[PDB]
Amino acid sequence: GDVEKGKKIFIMKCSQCHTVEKGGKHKTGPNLHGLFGRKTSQAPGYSYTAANKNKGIIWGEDTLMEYLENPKKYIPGTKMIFVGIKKKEERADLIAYLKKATNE
Ligand code: HEC
Numbered sequence: 001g002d003v004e005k006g007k008k009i010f011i012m013k014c015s016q017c018h019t020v021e022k023g024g025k026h027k028t029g030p031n032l033h034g035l036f037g038r039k040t041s042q043a044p045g046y047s048y049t050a051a052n053k054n055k056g057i058i059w060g061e062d063t064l065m066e067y068l069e070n071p072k073k074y075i076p077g078t079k080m081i082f083v084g085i086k087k088k089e090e091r092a093d094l095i096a097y098l099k100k101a102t103n104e
Contacts, residue, residue, distance in 0.1 A: 006097025009090055013082070020101040029080060032102050035059045040075075051077035064095050 010020070017028040024031045030046040037060060041053040055075045057063050067074045068091050070084040085091050 001096045002093045003097045003100050005090075006093035006095065007101070009085070009094045010097055010101075013085065013094070017080075017082075020098065022104070032098065035102050036099055049077060049079050051075050061095055061099070064098065065091050068094065 010018075018030070018032055019025050019027065020032045022033045024033060026043070026046045030043040030048070032043075034042075037058060039058055040055045041048045052075055065088070068085050071078050071080050071082055073084075085094065
């Protein structure tokens, strides 16, 4: 739940493909601002896969905990090529950071 540690994980693991700031660029992956409490596939201006659109979950602490352990198990056919993060506490820290930064 540690936002300082989660920021560092974001930078190392995610930041090459994602921005989190309001109005931030889409890059390889979508800008993530506003995601908490949204369905998948909601960022206008981004080309998602049908797999992502068809997942039909709401993004939130628990769903992101599962997704980020193993993205392709959670959303088969996703084009996010990221193997996932093993440690539950590392995912928890990252998600706390995302919950701060994507709501800012
Ligand atoms: C490129 C190598 C990426 C890295 C590293 C990470 N992500 Fe990603 N993400 C990427 C793409 C190309 C996509 C679109 C996938 C699709 O099938 O359309 C995504 C998607 C996400 C999502 C879902 C976004 C939404 O539904 O609106 C999330 C929540 C997400 N990515 C988060 C995320 C995090 C936290 C990362 C670090 C652990 C991370 N991704 C790495 C590309 C890439």
